[PDB]
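User
Please review the sequence:
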Amino acid sequence: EDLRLHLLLNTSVTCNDGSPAGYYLKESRGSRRWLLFLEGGWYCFNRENCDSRYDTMRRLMSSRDWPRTRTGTGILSSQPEENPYWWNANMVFIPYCSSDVWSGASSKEYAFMGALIIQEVVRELLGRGLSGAKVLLLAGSSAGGTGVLLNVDRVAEQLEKLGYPAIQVRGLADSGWFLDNKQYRHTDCVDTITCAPTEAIRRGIRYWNGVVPERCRRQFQEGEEWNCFFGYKVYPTLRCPVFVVQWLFDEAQLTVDNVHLVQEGLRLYIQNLGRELRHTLKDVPASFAPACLSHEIIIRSHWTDVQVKGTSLPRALHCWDRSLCPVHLVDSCPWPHCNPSCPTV
């Protein structure tokens, strides 16, 4: 009834500590639909920071403490009331071992192998019925939201080459759509939560040996690839269809912007921040963007609750799925919590 942990048979690919990585899987024999989900949870961009992560948040750097099962939740749920359309799919959960935002592409201190973990999961999954897929939805929240933009084209690229053009790769990027913007009040890039979006990815990419989508690559100068970690800069060049889910006021964005929760100025920064996001999302036909102040929704149980234009997110993904009922659901509402469906947990 729930998702069973499997470790990767090719043990070359590993977590930060070097423990083997893997995936949680729940099969649905009848279904030809698969969801792969990438866990979020920030990143770590140098030794001092990674060590500090290791002591504090060992789960996000090792497979040592990983439960033998997980219970599907939100979109991964098998409960038709939780997951009206997708409950019967085959579900894969990939724990965020790598700490690299899924960018890391080198085998060779810690090891950042996010991009390879995804490579290995897919090859193994083919062995388990994925070859019979008609749809592969690659989804993720937070850093997994970003991980999707970075990996989605690679995954499609990988499938054609292994000889499965029939599988239609798609993506869903929940809370992975960030802005490289001025912090409300500047802080030195010492502590991960506090470091500014650009400087953090500037440092990280070098550290992780991050690989970015080539199509995004050729659009920028070299040694300037950090650009591709931001949705609006990466989206236009995307070959696969990608649904974007984003709170007009992500908690995580406010964190990196150094907003701790008013002065007149403060109102405008937040006011503008929602404005800028709304703006970046104009060109994105398939998006769901409520004016609530929260981080992550897809993986959560109450995700069915949230509505934008009197439309459910789960409904919106269905419409979008059908399209390949409205599809561009973005709030035009100038303040946080100004939507009735805002989450309270």
